[PDB]
UniProtKB/Swiss-Prot annotation:
Organism listed in the record: Vibrio cholerae serotype O1 (strain ATCC 39541 / Classical Ogawa 395 / O395)
Protein name from the UniProt record: Sialidase
Lineage: Bacteria, Pseudomonadati, Pseudomonadota, Gammaproteobacteria, Vibrionales
Catalytic activity: Hydrolysis of alpha-(2->3)-, alpha-(2->6)-, alpha-(2->8)- glycosidic linkages of terminal sialic acid residues in oligosaccharides, glycoproteins, glycolipids, colominic acid and synthetic substrates
Lineage: superkingdom: Bacteria
CDD domains: Sialidase_non-viral (cd15482)
Length: 753
């Protein structure tokens, strides 16, 4: 909440008394509006008496101030005297800066509870306007810092005992004469509640084109709890502020219009602010109301998907939800030949004396030894697909030494392609077409086998391929038809088992196969619009992107979901590379990255920080509850950053929880990163308490901090830059109540070093 005074000549507000303040003078104390400085200002005349203005607060307001902090900003010039006291007393204590001009005319400041003085200015500067800031940070040992024209003057100012209870400004002394002119006074109590529990999962973004416009989001949880529960009906809600996050409009339910029968739960509002159009595009997941991500309950035949809503900042209008599920929710049969081999063979009776054709729509997730083959009783034709050292898609044909480079652009390397083999009896050769394009012709190898086969063929060569369709034809008749795209979307009432459909499963070692992705979820936090991609091959400026959570069947991982056309068409990137190990040739040990957040670095690389759920130890290596990743291709592929995990964040909580990361750019052009997460209480233990703020001045190599922003409950949070000097934070606190913090970043950074 803000309590302020802005000097103006406008009649309706031409005095502090007309702006909510109470006059509190004694004897000859007085005041008058002055214009001698070009801009109006209120002249406090404390000659022969006290001259001050006060504001009273309630018990609840003082408590909020103590737990979430406060800040006082003053723009004034001292004309003469002393005891110019602008402060806040809460009934038990106060931080009191005493400003005055000494006998030589220098502007100086002293602090109750502190001995000495600090000269702030001399000469003509001593009697000119200046900006004074007092910032109080909560904690077991809370203190305040004083800034003069943006520069840290005094830190760790201890509160002193006092019975006064009020916000005050002016000359607070009946005996000491003091005269000062005020242009503006602002006392802000941090922590206003914007969304109330049991609602949860906050995210927030602000407009750069229209400074002051902020859009916040959360999950409206009627009945409470995570999505997927029969006892709740969850929707996406939002509120907008046009004054920097001080006042907010009516809570708005964005998804009830597409949840008319309460048949769904919506979750994870992931907003992205696009400067090119000055709009906010928020993506969110849909789930049937009785099955979701937790417990892997959601299945491919269920209504999970992703939708988005668009907000026009200029006119302040929201647009109806748009479904993009088909673009980002993969439907296929997946074979993970990681630590083994898994092939499916269907014996056939092809006639090598006549033409035959086969089609296989395949996507290579990773590795090699991924193949599709067809044998017709005379010759065998095998196409082996792999990812080379450069990350390109390569094909090798049996009997041909020279490998064929199919794709070099990472996005196309891991996308689905239609591999079509056309055998010509009269030419005794087979032609390979990829996506309708003729690639090469070869003779294969002599063979007596007659079949069609696909999968990962080598236990010593890791590889994962996803298939959407397989067909073999001859004489205009389909000999084999396997539509995985269709089957993955069917209920258990339909037969989907390859072995029951006529195929033979040939497996060795350890492998896993399954149908389509169980679900896609934008995840908690905000997304970003890239603007430093000029030197990133395959990427582009303007790209909208966020790190989504994808569940294949049992395991969670993260992948980029992005759009290169403003949000109309979306594409998915590759999942994060994580270690895996089979214990005793039977127990799978791997990681499960989930709730993630990303930021674009100065050189265009993308830094991603992700929560690691469930198992966190692989082959004796503990990856902690959080791990950072890096992308050098616009978010298509990632790399796990060695030793860059929860440990780079000193005093971060040891419990798994969502965090937030974002870029902060100052007016001088300099920049750095901001990160928020609970510190735990004590700091460094498991607990969603005391939200902390970390800073990175080296592109995420190291982090400084944390600066404690909250004293008490602190769970999920999201931070975003508000303007050149402030960042806005939304955080879940007591009973998950989401509160707003508006932090003076350019000031706080001075408390580090
Ligand atoms: C900032 C502050 O607390 N000032 C207070 C002063 C000072 O304690 C004395 O002038 C000693 O300098 O005492 C008062 O009775 C006064 O003079 O009006 C009340 C006023 O609020
Ligand atoms: C979409 C969803 O259910 N995510 C939930 C998440 C999830 O269960 C965990 O990340 C394991 O995957 O847990 C929590 C949580 O406060 O810890 C809140 C989220 O609502
Ligand atoms: Ca409803
Ligand atoms: Ca539900
Ligand atoms: Ca987050
Ligand atoms: Ca699971």
């Amino acid at each position: 909440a803000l309590f302020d005074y802005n000097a103006t000549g406008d009649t309706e507000f031409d005095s502090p008394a007309k702006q909510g303040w109470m006059q509190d003078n004694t004897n000859n104390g007085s005041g008058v509006l002055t214009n001698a400085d070009g801009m109006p200002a209120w002249l406090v005349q404390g000659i022969g008496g006290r001259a001050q203005w006060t504001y009273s607060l309630s018990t609840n307001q003082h408590a909020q101030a103590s737990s979430f902090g406060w800040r006082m900003t003053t723009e004034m010039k001292v004309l003469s005297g002393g005891m110019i006291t602008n402060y806040y007393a809460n009934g038990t204590q106060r931080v009191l800066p005493i400003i005055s001009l000494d006998s030589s005319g220098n502007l100086v400041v002293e602090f109750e509870g502190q001995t000495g003085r600090t000269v702030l200015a001399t000469g003509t500067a001593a009697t000119e306007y200046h900006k004074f800031e007092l910032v109080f940070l909560p904690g077991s040992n809370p203190s305040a810092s004083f800034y003069f024209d943006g520069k840290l003057i005094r830190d760790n100012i201890q509160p002193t005992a006092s019975k006064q209870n009020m916000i005050v400004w002016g000359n607070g002394s009946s005996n000491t004469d003091g005269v000062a002119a005020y242009r503006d006074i602002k006392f802000e109590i941090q922590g206003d509640v914007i969304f109330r529990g049991p609602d949860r999962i906050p995210s927030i973004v602000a407009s750069s084109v229209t400074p002051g416009v902020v859009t916040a989001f959360a999950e409206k949880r009627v009945g409470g709890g995570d999505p997927g529960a029969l006892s709740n009906t969850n929707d996406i809600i939002t509120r907008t502020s046009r004054d920097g996050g001080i006042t907010w409009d009516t809570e708005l339910n964005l998804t009830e219009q597409i949840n008319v029968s309460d048949e769904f739960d919506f979750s994870d509002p992931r907003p992205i602010y696009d400067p090119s159009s000055n709009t906010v595009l928020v993506s969110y997941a849909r789930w049937p109301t009785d099955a979701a991500q937790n417990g892997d309950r959601i299945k491919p035949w269920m209504p999970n998907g992703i939708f988005y809503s668009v907000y026009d900042v200029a006119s302040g209008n929201w647009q109806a939800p748009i479904d993009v599920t088909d673009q980002v929710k993969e439907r296929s049969f997946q074979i993970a030949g990681w630590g083994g081999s898994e092939l499916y063979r269907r014996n056939t009776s092809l006639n090598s004396q006549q033409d035959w054709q086969s089609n296989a729509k395949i996507r290579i997730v990773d590795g090699a030894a991924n193949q599709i083959q067809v044998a017709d009783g005379s010759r065998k034709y095998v196409v082996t697909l792999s990812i080379d050292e450069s990350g390109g898609l390569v094909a090798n044909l049996n009997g041909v030494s020279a490998p064929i480079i199919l794709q070099s652009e990472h996005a196309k390397v891991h996308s689905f392609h239609d591999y079509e083999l056309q055998y010509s009896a009269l030419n005794h050769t087979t032609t390979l077409f990829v996506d309708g394009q003729q690639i090469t012709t070869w003779a294969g190898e002599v063979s007596q086998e007659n079949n069609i086969q696909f999968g990962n063929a080598d236990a010593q060569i890791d590889g994962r391929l996803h298939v959407q369709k397989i067909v073999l034809t001859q004489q205009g008749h389909n000999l084999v038809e396997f539509d995985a795209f269709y089957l993955a979307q069917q209920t258990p009432e339909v037969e989907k088992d390859l072995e029951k459909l006529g195929w033979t499963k040939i497996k060795t070692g350890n492998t896993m196969s399954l149908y389509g992705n169980a679900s896609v979820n934008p995840g908690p936090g905000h997304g970003i619009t890239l603007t430093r991609q000029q030197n990133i091959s395959g990427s582009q400026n303007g790209r909208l992107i966020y790190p989504a959570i994808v569940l294949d069947r049992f395991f969670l991982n993260v992948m980029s979901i992005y759009s290169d056309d403003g949000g109309s068409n979306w594409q998915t990137g590759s999942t994060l590379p994580i270690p895996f190990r089979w214990k005793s040739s039977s127990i799978l040990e791997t990681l499960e990255p989930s709730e993630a957040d990303m930021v674009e670095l100065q050189n265009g690389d993308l830094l991603l920080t992700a929560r690691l759920d469930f198992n966190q130890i692989v082959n004796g290596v503990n990856y902690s509850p959080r791990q950072q990743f890096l992308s050098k291709d616009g978010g298509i592929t990632w790399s796990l950053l060695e030793a860059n995990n929860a440990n780079v964040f000193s005093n971060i909580s040891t419990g798994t929880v969502d965090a937030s990361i974002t870029r902060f750019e100052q007016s001088d052009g300099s920049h750095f990163l901001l990160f928020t997460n609970p510190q735990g209480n004590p700091a460094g233990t498991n607990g969603r308490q005391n939200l902390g703020l970390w800073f990175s001045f080296d592109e995420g190599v190291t982090w400084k901090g944390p600066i404690q922003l909250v004293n008490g409950a602190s769970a999920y949070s999201d931070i975003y830059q508000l303007d050149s000097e402030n960042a806005i934070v939304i955080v879940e606190t007591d009973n998950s109540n989401m509160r707003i913090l508006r932090m003076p970043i350019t000031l706080l950074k001075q408390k580090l070093t």
